[PDB]
Amino acid sequence: MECRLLPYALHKWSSFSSTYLPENILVDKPNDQSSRWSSESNYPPQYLILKLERPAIVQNITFGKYEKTHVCNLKKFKVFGGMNEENMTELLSSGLKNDYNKETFTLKHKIDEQMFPCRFIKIVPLLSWGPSFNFSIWYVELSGIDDPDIVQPCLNWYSKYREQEAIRLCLKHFRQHN
Amino acid sequence: AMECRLLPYALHKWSSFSSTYLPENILVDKPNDQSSRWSSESNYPPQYLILKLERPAIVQNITFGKYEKTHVCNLKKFKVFGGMNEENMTELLSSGLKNDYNKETFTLKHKIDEQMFPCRFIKIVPLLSWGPSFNFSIWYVELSGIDDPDIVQPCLNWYSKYREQEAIRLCLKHFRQHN
């Protein structure tokens, strides 16, 4: 197989505090207490939306950390993904250890046995290890399959799937509201 | 049976209103009362009234009352829309009133091909006063058409099937425009 780092850019964010920029998640510098995104508050919604350079089967997410334990670290978070910003699919619900060790998590990337691609990944912090302090994310690395020979047929399948679901739900909702 | 009849309505939403020129003033036909009108707060868009019928109906006409004298606030141009909900309403009429003291009645679009369709909401959108200066004013509105449930219910059933087809067409058009 091949599994590759999937580059991304920061696309949207709920908020940020001071100089704790969304873009700080791009670099792994546990050596620097300011190299993180921090939300402005812990009240929802808070999130970062990452836009991949190209669509990919997004298989893992890796979170870096600070050199020491940190109150702002995410005790709980969710990850969503989709081909656009709206209607994203939940890919993961978990949490980080409050330590200085990088952690990698498998993301949902199949429906039944068929792989599906994302263009956007949304990280939703839910709980900090110390309840008061803003949510912080130090570093995010996405990995998966970006080989077009795999991604393209998955995109084709997934476009049809989402179209069928849109229709089914369009009519379901149309008929409920009548 | 199936006479064109007055269709009662209530005021549902409005863009704005000036001072005591309430949206509800369109419910009463009092041509000697200069204050018996809805007036928008300004003429900048969008301005509108949305009327909610008591029951769904085939809305066939709209009648506008007037003041006893000519008035600058009278609608030189206006449009009317209607729908089963407030969103995605259909244009039913684009016209204008005479600057006189005569009530005017206009036929509204109420068929798609040969099939009648019903509305629950009617939106009146003033566009021009006679009038360039003064705010948009509406003195009195009367809706008329068929509200006999033996006509309206089957028409609603058909229209739901029609709207479902259009929803599907547009859903796929919009899904496919976003590759």
Side-chain angles (χ1 to χ4, degrees):
Chain A
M1 266 274 78
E2 291 152 350
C3 182
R4 303 178 79 202
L5 185 156
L6 305 169
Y8 64 84
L10 274 292
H11 183 69
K12 284 190 182 182
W13 46 91
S14 45
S15 67
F16 70 93
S17 179
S18 177
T19 57
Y20 308 122
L21 303 182
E23 291 89 347
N24 284 340
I25 69 171
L26 290 164
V27 296
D28 188 18
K29 285 182 173 177
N31 201 355
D32 179 353
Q33 96 91 27
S34 77
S35 192
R36 52 175 158 148
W37 170 70
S38 289
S39 70
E40 194 138 64
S41 80
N42 286 345
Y43 297 105
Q46 302 293 335
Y47 57 85
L48 294 180
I49 303 182
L50 289 54
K51 185 179 184 184
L52 280 62
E53 293 190 350
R54 77 202 303 199
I57 312 312
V58 191
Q59 297 181 299
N60 311 288
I61 181 163
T62 298
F63 287 87
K65 297 183 180 168
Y66 185 52
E67 256 176 13
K68 305 295 199 200
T69 202
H70 212 296
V71 65
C72 291
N73 271 324
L74 275 23
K75 187 174 187 181
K76 188 172 182 195
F77 66 88
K78 287 177 174 188
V79 187
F80 298 82
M83 291 301 306
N84 45 70
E85 306 167 46
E86 306 84 14
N87 303 308
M88 289 199 193
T89 304
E90 186 177 315
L91 309 181
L92 176 60
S93 178
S94 189
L96 304 177
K97 305 177 179 171
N98 196 6
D99 63 23
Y100 48 70
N101 297 125
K102 209 116 116 181
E103 289 179 83
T104 301
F105 304 81
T106 303
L107 295 168
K108 179 181 176 63
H109 59 271
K110 290 183 285 181
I111 286 157
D112 302 326
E113 271 300 326
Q114 171 72 46
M115 291 187 169
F116 67 86
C118 302
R119 186 64 181 275
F120 297 91
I121 290 290
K122 179 165 75 165
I123 305 172
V124 179
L126 297 171
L127 256 186
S128 284
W129 270 103
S132 312
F133 302 74
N134 291 142
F135 300 132
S136 294
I137 296 174
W138 300 88
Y139 173 68
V140 172
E141 191 176 311
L142 302 176
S143 53
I145 296 162
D146 72 344
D147 184 351
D149 294 324
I150 296 168
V151 173
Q152 292 301 121
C154 293
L155 255 170
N156 196 295
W157 172 82
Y158 197 44
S159 291
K160 168 169 157 203
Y161 175 85
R162 289 177 304 113
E163 191 174 272
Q164 290 208 287
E165 278 298 282
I167 283 166
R168 189 183 64 83
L169 291 168
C170 171
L171 290 175
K172 190 160 194 187
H173 300 160
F174 177 95
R175 285 154 185 187
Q176 288 166 348
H177 312 179
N178 280 68
Chain B
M2 272 82 76
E3 294 98 351
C4 186
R5 300 176 291 273
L6 184 157
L7 303 169
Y9 64 85
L11 276 293
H12 184 68
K13 286 189 186 180
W14 47 91
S15 47
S16 73
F17 68 91
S18 178
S19 65
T20 54
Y21 304 112
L22 305 184
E24 292 86 348
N25 282 339
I26 72 170
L27 293 161
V28 289
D29 188 15
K30 282 182 171 178
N32 199 262
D33 183 354
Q34 94 87 26
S35 78
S36 192
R37 51 169 148 85
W38 169 68
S39 291
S40 66
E41 183 277 343
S42 79
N43 287 346
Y44 298 108
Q47 302 289 338
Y48 56 86
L49 296 178
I50 300 182
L51 288 51
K52 185 178 184 183
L53 283 57
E54 294 186 350
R55 287 196 297 197
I58 310 310
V59 190
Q60 298 177 296
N61 310 289
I62 183 163
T63 299
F64 286 84
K66 305 276 179 78
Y67 183 49
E68 249 176 9
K69 310 295 200 200
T70 202
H71 212 293
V72 183
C73 290
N74 272 325
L75 297 192
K76 185 173 188 180
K77 191 170 182 193
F78 66 88
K79 286 176 176 189
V80 183
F81 299 81
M84 291 299 306
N85 282 315
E86 307 169 46
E87 304 82 11
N88 309 308
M89 290 193 188
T90 309
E91 186 178 311
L92 309 182
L93 179 61
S94 178
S95 188
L97 304 174
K98 303 177 179 169
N99 199 9
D100 62 24
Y101 48 70
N102 294 126
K103 203 172 263 184
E104 284 179 81
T105 297
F106 303 82
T107 302
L108 296 167
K109 178 183 176 62
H110 58 273
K111 291 184 178 182
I112 289 154
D113 305 328
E114 276 94 326
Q115 279 83 48
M116 292 181 173
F117 67 86
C119 300
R120 188 63 182 274
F121 298 92
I122 291 293
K123 177 166 73 164
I124 305 165
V125 179
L127 297 171
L128 271 184
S129 285
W130 267 100
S133 317
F134 309 155
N135 292 336
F136 297 131
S137 294
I138 293 174
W139 299 90
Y140 171 70
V141 168
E142 188 176 309
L143 301 179
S144 55
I146 299 157
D147 71 345
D148 183 351
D150 295 326
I151 301 304
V152 177
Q153 188 61 55
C155 291
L156 192 39
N157 293 342
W158 173 82
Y159 192 45
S160 292
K161 279 140 55 201
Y162 176 85
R163 290 158 55 212
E164 204 172 79
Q165 282 215 290
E166 279 295 280
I168 281 166
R169 188 182 63 84
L170 293 168
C171 171
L172 289 174
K173 192 163 192 188
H174 301 161
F175 178 98
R176 284 156 186 191
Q177 283 165 345
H178 309 185
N179 284 9

